[PDB]
Amino acid sequence: MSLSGKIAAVTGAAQGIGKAIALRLAKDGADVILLDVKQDTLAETAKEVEALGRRAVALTADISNRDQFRSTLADAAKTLGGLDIMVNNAGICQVKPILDIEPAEIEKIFSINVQGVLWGMQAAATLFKEKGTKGKIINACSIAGHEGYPLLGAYSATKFAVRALTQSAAKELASSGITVNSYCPGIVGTDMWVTIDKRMAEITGTEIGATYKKYVEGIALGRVETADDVAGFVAYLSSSDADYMTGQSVLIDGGLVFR
Amino acid sequence: MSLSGKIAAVTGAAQGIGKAIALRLAKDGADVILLDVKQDTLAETAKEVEALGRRAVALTADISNRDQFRSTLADAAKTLGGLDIMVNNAGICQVKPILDIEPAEIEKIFSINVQGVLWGMQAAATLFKEKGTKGKIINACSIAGHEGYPLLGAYSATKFAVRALTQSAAKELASSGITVNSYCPGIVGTDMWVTIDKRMAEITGTEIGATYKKYVEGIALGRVETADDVAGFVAYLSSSDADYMTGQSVLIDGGLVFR
Amino acid sequence: MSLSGKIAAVTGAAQGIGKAIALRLAKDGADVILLDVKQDTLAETAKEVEALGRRAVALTADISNRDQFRSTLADAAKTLGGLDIMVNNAGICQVKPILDIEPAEIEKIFSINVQGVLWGMQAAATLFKEKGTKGKIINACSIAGHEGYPLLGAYSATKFAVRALTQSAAKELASSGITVNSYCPGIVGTDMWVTIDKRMAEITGTEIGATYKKYVEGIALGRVETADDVAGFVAYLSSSDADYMTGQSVLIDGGLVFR
Amino acid sequence: MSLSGKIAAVTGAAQGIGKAIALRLAKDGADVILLDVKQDTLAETAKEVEALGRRAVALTADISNRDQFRSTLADAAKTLGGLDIMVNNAGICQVKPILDIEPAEIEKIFSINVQGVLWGMQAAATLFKEKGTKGKIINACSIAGHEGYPLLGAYSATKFAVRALTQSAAKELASSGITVNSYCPGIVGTDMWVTIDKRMAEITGTEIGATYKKYVEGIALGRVETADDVAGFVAYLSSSDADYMTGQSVLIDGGLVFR
């Protein structure tokens, strides 16, 4: 029971990877702050956390709004009595060739994926420094944060930027006893990849379905990633056994990118 | 005379590294499109190019304005009769601890250093694809694009993002015969580093002068970098001898970051 | 709990990091095959494992002997009824300037650190494949397998080699259901660094104290690593929460090398 | 022009990439020390160098013999009146699955590819230091020194080792005014890849054709590399435009490995 007496906050917690993370951290002992954008789906996840025997707080928030993130996270931490782990999971993906990326498009993805991570690090680090907590910041990165991919230039740019922020924050926050690491998933099997494939097809002229299949064919381990696969590594990063790890952006990707 | 009959465009060309690049490319044979923000200093650099025996066009431009960059670069290319090399050199630096970075601050540095590079790649690639030119795109990156540094989180984030964009664009533009690479300088000896040191001191309590000295002490080769050091490698990247190199972000840094 | 029913083998198990690893895997549920070079100290460690209610086989072996390692590992796996996890921990260190490295010296460290890892990988994967088990190979790498360190040319070369073999093996063995990863510790012992620091001053004219400050006081977390820090991450890599991770060489180094 | 007055040594100079390198350095102005294993083909290459109005010394040597390499290089440097540039080009390749690599096999490739590079570095740096020259050591690395490739475990391990020794040597020799870098070609010959592709299918159950497509048709630029591509970058690394570059292992690979 690694996380007994701990409090973890997770962004994008209502579904997908963030939900899996929230539930895994709750199973390992933590009370959970669930942040997302739709109250009704958040409330459902909150009940599943409470069913596992933990306390949950479920609040809508815009991770791209610096001051509101800070205040909302502080409200939730006050309600539960602390904060020990911050998982900056929420992000968005875009698909567009380098030549066709437009200004509003790229401003939008940076606002969510880069500023939103930054604002969450700041909100959590502020709270940690208040009680002298040896806190953990855990950011969502990607295989696309280690290598730039075609048609994913904007997304890759934001995940490289999250890696940068991970490193700079690890170095600056170490003297406050706060570690900062990222997790880098591969191909996580979702309806989302069906959407990516569709777009990719219309852009290129390949057959619908072909691109998603070809990507899966590339994974050394021969299967797609589950949200629980990602959650298992986030659980390690949340634990005492990661105390001495900081600044790292670790691939759990089935053998796609090798570092 | 590697660049005879070639046309190169350089952003931030009026001074510093961009000026050194412009002059070196002109010495190697190219006619030069000089882009920057002050007409009077641009005009001076233009005259030095013309003194080396080349043609120059010198135009003010805001690299963060997508459509204006495209049209201005096109005007200059029409005036000279082509475009073969695009050097996205201009950028800005900020100094601020991770916890204190503000929304307008980070929007500003991304607009210049990330969007501005993107818009220049798009402007140049459009022109190359018009005549079937085997063009070269060369982006300014940094040691801070390979490792995140303390107090340089925003800057590092933008240079990691430029590396991403370099990779994704190299992969997507290869079939058009266009290569995309970046150069990554170290500590380039300038009044700029005196300013960085000053800020860093006020933030931390170290002595004015101490931080710049300590950084120089770190360079394996034992001397600071000159703008001509950077220009020499940009000259290689502009040449035939770099035809088979694409997607790379190469450190010319005196032995600071090792990849 | 985490490794209930599993059997693990660990080289260099009698003392040090390897003993910590062995004891942690036993605490987590695994019976252990302890391999090292001195029977008396192996026997002591086996008794600690047995006191946990775990089964232990303790056998002397030379990791650099391909055929002997194969047969000794197979003998132990037969005794215990299987083999799930192979930790290639044992290795040696040498401190010598690049210019002074001699033929017998470099052959010795490659024999132990590179051939020894390869022979272990071969011994364990032969067992996993002949039985059909989904096994895990876990190799000891280092900060020095990610960056070459002064006076550690030979050691760094061997650790880089280990990372290469981790990646090639991960790619080749994935279709047999076998994962291959490495763990990369930072600075555990400090005496070697005093030595290195002195010798760096003598051979390059660095100041005394300055290399030790750079590397030992350069650790972001501000403390040296313990054997338990290392064993904690090895326990993660042994666990089902690492099932989807392959080909990786992960730094648990207190913030020294950033990837 | 670029290397006027310089003297360079190149191993594997009789044929192939090493002959291209030798001829390019001669064209650029350097007298050349040609080192290889067969006197008759060395003599032919020396005659091509001499036809340029350059001086050549052609001597047989075994790069894996430390003392002999030292004395033969010194003999040649004395004949020509100095030594400025050392290119450690010669190496061998092997294709073998990780599980099947044998002791004499791996010892052979490490002897040639790792010890041979180290002995060359030592032979040249001894000369540079005893005379006080600011020399350049340039080592042959590979895509396989940045990522481990299937069936190329041993070769990849040696090339990773070469990158380590490049970095350690760069750090140790900088204070003597010596730079150390590596060049990392991609895919030049295609026959080896057909072999690898077949053998991958046999050992992992991949489809025939699928490995060759992944690696050979995965080159972004869409064509294999020539010896001239490699020699062009080696010419840059020999030149004063690389003075500030040290510790680097640069990919000229058509867009295969992205760093």
TrEMBL record, chains A, B, C, D:
Record GO terms (molecular function): diacetyl reductase ((S)-acetoin forming) (NAD+) activity; quinone binding
One Pfam family cited in the UniProt record for this chain: adh_short
Active-site residue numbers: 155
E.C. numbers: 1.1.1.304
Catalytic activity: (S)-acetoin + NAD(+) = diacetyl + NADH + H(+)
EC class: oxidoreductase
Alphabetical list of InterPro entries matching this protein: 23BDH (IPR014007), NAD(P)-bd_dom_sf (IPR036291), Sc_DH/Rdtase_CS (IPR020904), SDR_fam (IPR002347)
Coiled coil residues, start to end: none
Annotated GO biological process: acetoin catabolic process; fatty acid biosynthetic process
Alphabetic keyword roster: NAD, Oxidoreductase
Domain of life: Bacteria
SUPFAM superfamilies referenced in this protein's UniProt entry, alphabetically: NAD(P)-binding Rossmann-fold domains
Residues at which NAD(+) binds: 15-17, 36, 89, 155, 159, 185-190
PROSITE patterns cross-referenced by the UniProt entry: ADH_SHORT
PANTHER family for this protein: 3-OXOACYL-(ACYL-CARRIER-PROTEIN) REDUCTASE, SHORT-CHAIN DEHYDROGENASES/REDUCTASES FAMILY MEMBER
Family per similarity comment: Belongs to the short-chain dehydrogenases/reductases (SDR) family.
Protein name: diacetyl reductase [(S)-acetoin forming]
Source species: Gluconobacter oxydans (strain 621H) (Gluconobacter suboxydans)
Species lineage: Bacteria, Pseudomonadati, Pseudomonadota, Alphaproteobacteria, Acetobacterales
